[PDB]
Design a protein around this motif. Structure first.
Motif, PDB file in Angstrom:
ATOM      1  N   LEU A  92      40.186  33.291  60.499  1.00 51.60           N
ATOM      2  CA  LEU A  92      41.205  33.270  59.447  1.00 51.60           C
ATOM      3  C   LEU A  92      40.702  32.572  58.201  1.00 51.60           C
ATOM      4  CD1 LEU A  92      44.015  33.974  58.440  1.00 51.60           C
ATOM      5  CD2 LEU A  92      44.855  31.853  59.586  1.00 51.60           C
ATOM      6  N   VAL A  93      40.070  31.412  58.384  1.00 50.26           N
ATOM      7  CA  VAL A  93      39.575  30.637  57.243  1.00 50.26           C
ATOM      8  C   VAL A  93      38.510  31.437  56.472  1.00 50.26           C
ATOM      9  CG1 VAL A  93      38.555  28.429  56.416  1.00 50.26           C
ATOM     10  CG2 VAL A  93      40.231  28.440  58.306  1.00 50.26           C
ATOM     11  N   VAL A  94      37.597  32.100  57.177  1.00 48.88           N
ATOM     12  CA  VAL A  94      36.565  32.895  56.490  1.00 48.88           C
ATOM     13  C   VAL A  94      37.194  34.101  55.793  1.00 48.88           C
ATOM     14  CG1 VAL A  94      34.265  33.934  56.536  1.00 48.88           C
ATOM     15  CG2 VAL A  94      34.818  32.141  58.062  1.00 48.88           C
ATOM     16  N   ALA A  95      38.147  34.750  56.462  1.00 41.82           N
ATOM     17  CA  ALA A  95      38.882  35.887  55.890  1.00 41.82           C
ATOM     18  C   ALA A  95      39.616  35.456  54.605  1.00 41.82           C
ATOM     19  CB  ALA A  95      39.876  36.490  56.932  1.00 41.82           C
ATOM     20  N   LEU A  96      40.210  34.262  54.615  1.00 42.66           N
ATOM     21  CA  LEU A  96      40.884  33.705  53.435  1.00 42.66           C
ATOM     22  C   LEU A  96      39.880  33.384  52.288  1.00 42.66           C
ATOM     23  CD1 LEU A  96      43.710  31.572  55.170  1.00 42.66           C
ATOM     24  CD2 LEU A  96      43.987  33.629  53.763  1.00 42.66           C
ATOM     25  N   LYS A  97      38.716  32.826  52.629  1.00 45.08           N
ATOM     26  CA  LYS A  97      37.629  32.585  51.645  1.00 45.08           C
ATOM     27  C   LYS A  97      37.173  33.905  50.964  1.00 45.08           C
ATOM     28  CE  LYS A  97      35.519  28.362  53.708  1.00 45.08           C
ATOM     29  NZ  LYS A  97      35.741  27.481  52.525  1.00 45.08           N
ATOM     30  N   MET A  98      37.041  34.966  51.759  1.00 43.02           N
ATOM     31  CA  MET A  98      36.655  36.290  51.257  1.00 43.02           C
ATOM     32  C   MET A  98      37.743  36.876  50.392  1.00 43.02           C
ATOM     33  SD  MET A  98      33.460  37.019  52.139  1.00 43.02           S
ATOM     34  CE  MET A  98      32.152  36.180  53.316  1.00 43.02           C
ATOM     35  N   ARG A  99      38.990  36.815  50.874  1.00 44.62           N
ATOM     36  CA  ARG A  99      40.117  37.336  50.129  1.00 44.62           C
ATOM     37  C   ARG A  99      40.318  36.647  48.786  1.00 44.62           C
ATOM     38  NH1 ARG A  99      46.388  37.109  52.206  1.00 44.62           N
ATOM     39  NH2 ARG A  99      47.297  38.246  50.419  1.00 44.62           N
ATOM     40  N   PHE A 100      40.155  35.326  48.761  1.00 49.68           N
ATOM     41  CA  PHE A 100      40.397  34.547  47.517  1.00 49.68           C
ATOM     42  C   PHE A 100      39.108  34.053  46.805  1.00 49.68           C
ATOM     43  CE2 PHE A 100      44.340  33.685  50.192  1.00 49.68           C
ATOM     44  CZ  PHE A 100      45.100  34.678  49.588  1.00 49.68           C
ATOM     45  N   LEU A 101      37.994  34.737  47.076  1.00 49.34           N
ATOM     46  CA  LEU A 101      36.681  34.416  46.493  1.00 49.34           C
ATOM     47  C   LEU A 101      36.701  34.442  44.964  1.00 49.34           C
ATOM     48  CD1 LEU A 101      33.892  33.818  47.976  1.00 49.34           C
ATOM     49  CD2 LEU A 101      33.241  36.101  47.289  1.00 49.34           C
ATOM     50  N   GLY A 102      37.472  35.374  44.387  1.00 50.78           N
ATOM     51  CA  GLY A 102      37.628  35.506  42.943  1.00 50.78           C
ATOM     52  C   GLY A 102      38.361  34.355  42.277  1.00 50.78           C
ATOM     53  N   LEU A 103      39.153  33.603  43.046  1.00 45.72           N
ATOM     54  CA  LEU A 103      39.852  32.428  42.542  1.00 45.72           C
ATOM     55  C   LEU A 103      38.945  31.199  42.362  1.00 45.72           C
ATOM     56  CD1 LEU A 103      43.272  32.562  44.493  1.00 45.72           C
ATOM     57  CD2 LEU A 103      42.685  33.703  42.367  1.00 45.72           C
ATOM     58  N   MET A 104      37.716  31.234  42.878  1.00 48.92           N
ATOM     59  CA  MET A 104      36.756  30.143  42.719  1.00 48.92           C
ATOM     60  C   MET A 104      35.856  30.421  41.532  1.00 48.92           C
ATOM     61  SD  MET A 104      35.364  29.712  46.676  1.00 48.92           S
ATOM     62  CE  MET A 104      34.648  31.447  46.653  1.00 48.92           C
ATOM     63  N   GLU A 105      35.248  29.368  40.985  1.00 42.01           N
ATOM     64  CA  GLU A 105      34.247  29.528  39.918  1.00 42.01           C
ATOM     65  C   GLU A 105      32.976  30.125  40.556  1.00 42.01           C
ATOM     66  N   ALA A 106      32.201  30.847  39.739  1.00 42.40           N
ATOM     67  CA  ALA A 106      30.952  31.535  40.153  1.00 42.40           C
ATOM     68  C   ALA A 106      29.993  30.679  40.968  1.00 42.40           C
ATOM     69  CB  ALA A 106      30.217  32.102  38.926  1.00 42.40           C
ATOM     70  N   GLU A 107      29.735  29.467  40.487  1.00 39.76           N
ATOM     71  CA  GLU A 107      28.851  28.516  41.182  1.00 39.76           C
ATOM     72  C   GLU A 107      29.388  28.162  42.572  1.00 39.76           C
ATOM     73  N   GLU A 108      30.698  27.918  42.660  1.00 40.79           N
ATOM     74  CA  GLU A 108      31.363  27.588  43.931  1.00 40.79           C
ATOM     75  C   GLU A 108      31.320  28.754  44.932  1.00 40.79           C
ATOM     76  OE1 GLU A 108      32.439  24.450  44.937  1.00 40.79           O
ATOM     77  OE2 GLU A 108      32.823  25.362  46.894  1.00 40.79           O
ATOM     78  N   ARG A 109      31.444  30.004  44.464  1.00 36.75           N
ATOM     79  CA  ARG A 109      31.345  31.193  45.338  1.00 36.75           C
ATOM     80  C   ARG A 109      29.982  31.251  46.025  1.00 36.75           C
ATOM     81  NH1 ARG A 109      32.935  35.462  40.586  1.00 36.75           N
ATOM     82  NH2 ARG A 109      35.005  34.565  40.125  1.00 36.75           N
ATOM     83  N   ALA A 110      28.909  31.152  45.234  1.00 36.03           N
ATOM     84  CA  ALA A 110      27.524  31.127  45.740  1.00 36.03           C
ATOM     85  C   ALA A 110      27.339  30.014  46.775  1.00 36.03           C
ATOM     86  CB  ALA A 110      26.524  30.950  44.588  1.00 36.03           C
TER      87      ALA A 110
END
Lengths: 164, 164
Positions: A92-110
């Motif tokens: 669930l946590v990984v699925a949520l990270k993937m779903r809301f990946l666009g809500l993080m800054e570029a550096e934080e996504r990487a």
């Protein structure tokens, strides 16, 4: 589905059911097996082998111990219990990270993808440790399979990271 | 690693962060998303969306709601948090079933493998439901990957079952 204390008990009772062992040897084995599959699992450190002797599930002869009739019933009851997709919250946590990946800054996504890669690498190394050559067992077969899927996950995550 | 209540909160805060929604719509969405990944998750039914409005993480305008500045900080804090191989206990339980498979009677071994197949089938169907055509998102990519690994697990389990 089993509680974390019941999973550790299943590990202890199954390990002692094969061959009698000294307290220290049983504790060391359970700690190693559980921690190789689940990672450090620091919350389970209190779940010790001392209580098993207290309830008459294990009997004596740093004492040499062995399983009892009560321990074998508990072992079967624990061993023949259902799993669940509940009790693996990381999915669930990984699925949520993937779903809301666009809500993080570029550096934080990487960085988040770097952390997932680090976790898969670590998990592969622990399972390789546990696996050790010489197949035949259901456990060796399962570990080879689980590691093959983990290697695919690692490659997928590295591909993902390279596209960012 | 997040608590189950925090994972549900992450789902709610991320969902409401995109577009404002009515209480009923947000509750329905979170329930559907969490339950498709984790299965029924009946223990999480009490973890409702009402508390978010109580702490000022979500604000009004079956009321129409929207995220607040406090909610966005909590969202980032929850979203940028580590996973663990601890918080997916089913891996240990399945590893223990494989390791101690010989301690069960022949009929019970076959039955346990039938149950694992049933679980993977069920999980694939839930993820297919969630996935719905039209890619591009990190979530769609992750779901396609997770389903590919699940299909491999299903085939491996069916192979195993056919060898018993």
């Amino acid at each position: 589905t089993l509680t974390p204390k019941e999973a550790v008990r299943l590990c202890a009772l199954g390990t002692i059911a094969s061959q009698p062992m000294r307290y220290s040897e049983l504790a060391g084995s359970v700690r190693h097996f559980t921690s190789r599959i689940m990672g450090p699992s620091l919350e389970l450190m209190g779940i010790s082998i001392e209580l098993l002797r207290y309830e008459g599930l294990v009997e004596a002869v740093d004492a040499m111990l062995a399983i009892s009739a009560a321990g074998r019933r508990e072992l079967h009851s624990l061993l023949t219990a259902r799993l669940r997709p509940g009790s693996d919250l990381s999915k669930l946590v990984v699925a949520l990270k993937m779903r809301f990946l666009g809500l993080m800054e570029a550096e934080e996504r990487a960085h988040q993808i770097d952390l997932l890669i680090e976790g898969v690498d670590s998990e592969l190394a622990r399972l390789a440790d546990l696996r050790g050559g010489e197949g035949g067992s259901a456990l060796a077969a399962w570990l080879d399979h689980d590691m093959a899927l983990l290697e695919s996950r690692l490659a997928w995550l590295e591909d993902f990271r390279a596209r960012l």
